[PDB]
Design a protein around this ligand. Structure first.
Ligand code: HEM
Ligand SMILES: CC(=O)[C@H]1CC[C@H]2[C@@H]3CCC4=CC(=O)CC[C@]4(C)[C@H]3CC[C@]12C
Length: 466
């Protein structure tokens, strides 16, 4: 009796469980590195830190490419910008100019910390009006960090009530939902198989956003002067008139770059805040210690500041643990091999998509103790007097040529938002008992479901205004 001809095989069910976890589970069978092939395209999936650091760092320039996706073509305006641009002149030029801009905010009246604390103070104010109510803090936060990024890009911010923020949130939500059903890593290229309106939807959202950007671009071409270089949009225009590069800095090129900066800045950081609050509602004991800690080292004589990250250690560990358990990009962004190269002595041909399963790196049992648990203690020494790095299998922000450019902005924004929130507010479970689900919704960003927090102004903050 004969066996059936097999026209295709896949190692697990599509749309069943989270991709990053499904790949992780296969390592029991196949090893920390393996490949899958769809049609003519081969994809490799790496899930151990050693091989990862080889793809990211050691042979970084070999694997610094981005694969083309129908859905990303639209968002990045045909692989422009930074995040979704192939490695090349365009990419390298803009990446450095972006990174350069963060130097203009290292001191002065535009010290990044001052720009941040300003919008947080607007934030805490707004929230305080909801004293004794249960609310979704997504949009109050979205607004705060949008303002920070807008100040970095244009030296401007939005006024409270401005409906442009709403327009932005709508297309932000729409781009994310249509960018991919789930993770960016798709096994089967569904959208090319069945009739669907996925691309039409994404175009019409991204059109709105590109309109809004182009509008800002025009109403800044007049306000620009080489005598004043203070923000990201200045930096890009400075470098354009000095030009071989006149093509690499067209309108569409600066548009799309500002695009990635705006998106990355707001969505990643707002997601992580939410994940942070969510975890603390599940773990009161930790929350108590964070309250206890903040009262000892900052009290109520003043508002928190960067310099406090040197003493508010448990808060720092907490943020570190949230980024461990729930990475923003559980599988980073997909990489590509620019040349023929190797990983763990295995040949990898030019054009091969390479995927780093960061989920596997943060949940590896040999590297972490009880990795499935939320234990910020893991990032502190046994006394709790300094921070540690208990594993090298940890890469929230990536590494090497395509690593995160806004890590420093992000780490600060997060630290300040929580510290302020913790100083001023009692954050509790809403009256009907519902906690949020820490299962999460993997899209291009690892989101959490909407949820509510009952929010009260702490007595100790009130009884210290007299
Ligand atoms: C907690 C917050 C954040 C996390 C965990 C994070 C993490 C990451 C990761 C994993 C990547 C891709 C790594 C790779 O492809 O190898 C990335 C890329 C990038 N991130 Fe972030 N990020 C965060 C916040 C931000 C912020 C605040 C900005 C502000 C501008 C930003 C801008 C970018 C850009 C432009 C890239 C593309 C890099 C490239 O293609 O060369 N991100 N980030
Ligand atoms: C963490 C990360 O990789 C960042 C780098 C580029 C960022 C994205 C590119 C710009 C962008 C625009 C949007 O309208 C939704 C948010 C997105 C889709 C951004 C979400 C987070 C990304 C994917």
């Amino acid at each position: 009796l004969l066996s059936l001809p097999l026209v295709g095989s896949l190692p697990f069910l599509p749309r069943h469980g989270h991709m990053h976890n499904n790949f992780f589970k296969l390592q029991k069978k196949y090893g920390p590195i393996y490949s899958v092939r769809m049609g003519t395209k081969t994809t490799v999936i790496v899930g151990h830190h050693q091989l990862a650091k080889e793809v990211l760092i050691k042979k970084g320039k070999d694997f610094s490419g981005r694969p083309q996706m129908a859905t990303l073509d639209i968002l990045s305006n045909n692989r422009k910008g930074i995040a979704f641009a192939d490695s090349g002149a365009h990419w390298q030029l803009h990446r450095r100019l972006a990174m350069a801009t963060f130097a203009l905010f290292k001191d002065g009246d535009q010290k990044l910390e001052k720009i941040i604390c300003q919008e947080i103070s607007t934030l805490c104010d707004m929230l305080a009006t909801h004293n004794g109510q249960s609310i979704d803090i997504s949009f109050p936060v979205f607004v705060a960090v949008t303002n920070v990024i807008s100040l970095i890009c244009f030296n401007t911010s939005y006024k409270n009530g401005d409906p442009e923020l709403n327009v932005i949130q709508n297309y932000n939500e729409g781009i994310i939902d249509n960018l991919s059903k789930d993770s960016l890593v798709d096994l089967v290229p569904w959208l090319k198989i069945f009739p669907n309106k996925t691309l039409e939807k994404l175009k019409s959202h991204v059109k709105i956003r590109n309109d809004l950007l182009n509008k800002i671009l025009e109403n800044y071409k007049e306000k620009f002067r080489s005598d004043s270089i203070t923000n990201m949009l200045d930096t890009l225009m400075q470098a354009k008139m000095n030009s071989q590069d006149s093509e690499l800095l067209s309108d569409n090129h600066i548009l799309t770059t500002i695009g990635d900066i705006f998106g990355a800045g707001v969505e990643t950081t707002t997601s992580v805040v939410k994940w942070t609050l969510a975890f603390l509602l599940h773990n009161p004991q930790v929350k108590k210690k964070l309250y206890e800690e903040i009262d000892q080292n900052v009290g109520f004589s003043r508002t928190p500041t960067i310099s406090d990250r040197n003493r508010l250690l448990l808060l720092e560990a907490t943020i570190r643990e949230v980024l461990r358990l729930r990475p923003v990009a559980p599988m980073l962004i997909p990489h590509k091999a620019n040349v023929d190269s190797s990983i763990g002595e295995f040949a990898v041909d030019k054009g091969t998509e390479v995927i780093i399963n960061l989920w596997a790196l943060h949940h590896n049992e040999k590297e972490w103790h009880q990795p499935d648990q939320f234990m910020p203690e893991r990032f502190l020494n046994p006394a709790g007097t300094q921070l540690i790095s208990p594993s090298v299998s940890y890469l929230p922000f990536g590494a090497g040529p395509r690593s995160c450019i806004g890590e420093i902005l992000a780490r600060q924004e997060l630290f300040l938002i929580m510290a302020w929130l913790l100083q001023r507010f009692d954050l509790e479970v809403p009256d009907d008992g519902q906690l949020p689900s820490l299962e999460g919704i993997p899209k291009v960003v690892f989101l959490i479901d909407s949820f509510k927090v009952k929010i009260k102004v702490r007595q100790a903050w009130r009884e210290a205004q007299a």
